[PDB]
Structure 1
């Protein structure tokens, strides 16, 4: 009955066509609630009676951590039919006093679209990104938090590059989207297939462009560096606040700055914020000083028309519907490289990139605010200030 019970619990939430799934255990109750169009409904009460006797066994059956019931966890679930027309869930686990509560929010690979022109890049930034992904070598780091649009931007680059003249092979943990003509390896760390082993196999597979799901340790980073310096364009990912903090993250990991300065051609940082609801969007009164204090460049300010959804069902009573990406696309220009040779810190890199005209994710969010697709509060929710 335990095998059936675990199968029932996992299957029912998926089965009932819920827009958000809330699984909440308590001291005396254990409930499932569906958020449908911004509103929660209690949808199921599993029994308290079988919780403790068959505890560890089910936790092993659902491939969950049987020993940990105390800390938050965050992930992604991409479910494809083979390819990219994949329905996916953003999964968040939270430790309540009587067990872990999980919240699942639905999204799609294509509703958040893979056209690099549709990703929100400024013309210089879009130029640098397209120019960067079409180079024969170097490192491109797409940075941002979880749920920030990273997989779409990298895949947008892969689509831009997927041509019959080049051999594309990717190593992902896991593979988010399938591409015919691209040799995609999903990491199977258990059998020894991790990012390092897959990169080395790619390196034994006569590769031209190598994609690694993530730079996890300095050794894998170093192998990626090797692949980049031997003549391959290597693209990978880190979870950081912005592009320069990714620099400081690798420097803090122990990589010499000059390797950072030499191997990386472009670092982008990004985000997903909610787009104002087109049904209830209204212009919103926001003081000019708060927008200036939040990071907007002086020339875009007077033009801003900030919209806010009053909150309807298509925005989950949030006033926002869909997502918008806010980007800071900083190229590793040769002067910046010289600065590394002159020992500049990451903060100096940030100062110089702003000096070079690179708008931050905050300024790009304020740009989205300017076009009236997001609100200033969304800009503040998803990005940090440039001040």
Structure 2
């Protein structure tokens, strides 16, 4: 039963190695253990096959799960105590043929969230970001997958808006960060505690500020928007292919455009692209046609270079140390506010914003590759 302690080491190290998640998972003889370093699970160690049930006992005990329910999966709130952690970690266990799988999404701290600028918001792009989060109320749409960086933006906004004078309350599946000035709540749509339910719970906590981990049901958008419309500042996320689509998407989702318009101040498209570690960065030259389409033109193409995440100790072995986000910012002026209610397509909205000086995910991903931040490997893999 060695993992009664080993797991705690996994959990501890997941924080120390800058992982977002803790995983202890079995093999035929031993158990594969990984930390989600810079967004990807890495081979931390292994532990004895039988020890996997000890692992389970650790993760179940710390979060109050029925220690005996190794027959079906359960989840909870880990009052986790080891090293750097004094965190309600986001616990789950699941029975597997070689012993039950043990997981804790890390409940990271405010210090683990890159700023609303740091993520890579180009001057004009950032100005628009600020226009939105500086309002006393309204909605900010952010969009992409887990690993889109939307979490970083969303909770970096909290770092920039969740103050002592604002009742910040978040809605997250599960809570990813531990931030001051805020009451950050754990959400589970599979249990019926969807973001729509959590949004009602949120409003009953009488907030000034809201963060929403995912807009999925029409209601998650609509009630996050209601919060804005009850005088709150609302920051919320979707999974679309652009900023423009976040508006189009809320219309596609049946989120009444008049509520989108009532609150919407602006929209951020977002994607993480892995960031090349300076201890492994390798210069390579990109293709002119790809580059034309990505927004370079001839002179930049002649001098264009990409930087590859070749691999080093300082990148967790991923080739990249951390990730940066690709950013596209739309401000809802009246041409756009019209576009919201008119049900305009993502192309229509994006092109208006580009006319106004907005850079797209495609142009930004590229620029970051050219800059020495990433490569048109990761960019392309993680962009539109």
| Length-normalised TM-score, structure 2 | 0.73
Q: Distance in 2 between matches of 1:232 and 1:288?
A: 47
**Aligned with 1:124: secondary structure?**
helix
3-state SS of paired residue (1:118): coil
Correspondence for 2:363:
363
Matches of 1:232 and 1:36, distance apart in 2 = 34
Which of 46, 49, 55 is matched with 1:46 structurally? 49
Contact 2:2 2:51 in 1 (8 A): no
Please report how far the alpha carbon of residue 154 of structure 1 lies from its aligned counterpart in structure 2 after TM superposition. 2.1
The answer (yes or no) to whether the contact 2:261–2:340 under 8 Å persists in 1 is yes
Secondary structure at the aligned position of 2:295 is classed as coil
Query: Judging changes above 3 Å, is the alpha-carbon distance between structure 1 residues 36 and 123 closer, same or farther for their aligned structure 2 residues?
Result: closer
Shift of 1:184: 4.6
Structure 1 SS opposite 2:358: coil
Which secondary structure state, in structure 2, belongs to the residue aligned with residue 132 of structure 1? helix
Give distance in 1, aligned partners of 2:363 and 2:120: 12
Answer with 39-48 or 215-224: which moved more. 39-48
Q: Is 2:13 the partner of 1:13?
A: no
Contact 1:195–1:212 under 8 Å retained in 2: no
User: Do the aligned partners of residues 65 and 119 (structure 1) sit closer, same or farther apart at CA in structure 2, a change above 3 Å counting?
Assistant: farther
Aligned residue pair count: 362
1:1-387 superposed matches below 5 A: 7=4, 10-11=7-8, 13-14=10-11, 23-25=24-26, 28-33=28-33, 40=43, 43-47=46-50, 61=66, 67=72, 109=109, 113-163=113-163, 166-173=165-172, 174-186=174-186, 194-202=197-205, 205=206, 207-293=207-293, 295-298=294-297, 301=301, 304-384=304-384
Cα deviations by residue, 1:52-76 (Å, 9 ceiling, x for unpaired): xx9xx99x6469895579xxxxxxx
Shift of 1:141: 1.6
Instruction: Return closer, same or farther for 1:110/1:135 CA change in 2, 3 Å cut-off.
Output: closer
Cα deviation 1:32-88 (Å, max 9, x = unaligned): 25689998576323139989xx9xx99x6469895579xxxxxxx99799xx99999
Distance 2:36 2:224 in 1: 44
Query: 2: CA distance between counterparts of 1:185 and 1:284?
Result: 45
Question: CA offsets per residue over residues 259-285 of structure 1, 9 Å max, x none?
Answer: 334432211122222222212323212
Q: Secondary structure of the equivalent of 1:31?
A: strand
Shift of 1:211: 3.8
Larger radius of gyration: 1
Cα–Cα, structure 1 residues 341 and 163, in superposed 2: closer, same or farther, change >3 Å? closer
Deviation at 1:140, TM superposition (A): 0.6
User: Which moved further from structure 2: 148-157 or 117-126?
Assistant: 148-157
The one-character-per-residue Cα deviations of 1:72-117 (angstroms, maximum 9, x if unpaired) are xxxxx99799xx9999999999999989978999896577554333
Provide Cα deviations, 1:301-344, integer angstroms capped at 9, x if missing partner: 45533222433232345432222211122222311222345552
Deviation at 1:244, TM superposition (A): 3.2
Measured in 2, the distance between the counterparts of 1:224 and 1:383 equals: 26
**CA contact under 8 A between 1:139 and 1:263: conserved in structure 2?**
yes
Gaps of at least 5 residues in structure 2 are: none
Aligned-residue offset at 1:146: 0.6
Higher mean C-alpha deviation, range 313-322 or range 296-305 = 296-305
Structure with the higher fraction of residues in strand conformation? 2
Unaligned ranges ≥5, structure 1:
70-76
2:53 and 2:100 in contact (8 A); partners too: no
8 Å contact kept, 1:29–1:48: no
CA distance in structure 2 between the aligned counterparts of 1:103 and 1:12, rounded to whole angstroms: 13
| Farther off after superposition, 338-347 or 17-26 | 17-26
Distance in 2 of aligned mates of 1:277 and 1:198? 42
The secondary structure found in structure 2 opposite 1:151 is helix
Match of 1:74 in 2: none
Structure 1 residues 90 and 129, CA gap change in structure 2 (3 angstroms):
farther
Distance 1:330 1:122 in 2: 13
Residue in structure 2 matched with residue 73 of structure 1 by the alignment: none
* CA distance in 2 between partners of 1:216 and 1:90 (Å): 21
Contact kept? 2:155, 2:211, Cα under 8 Å: no
Q: Are the counterparts in 1 of residues 167 and 181 from structure 2 also a CA contact under 8 Å?
A: yes
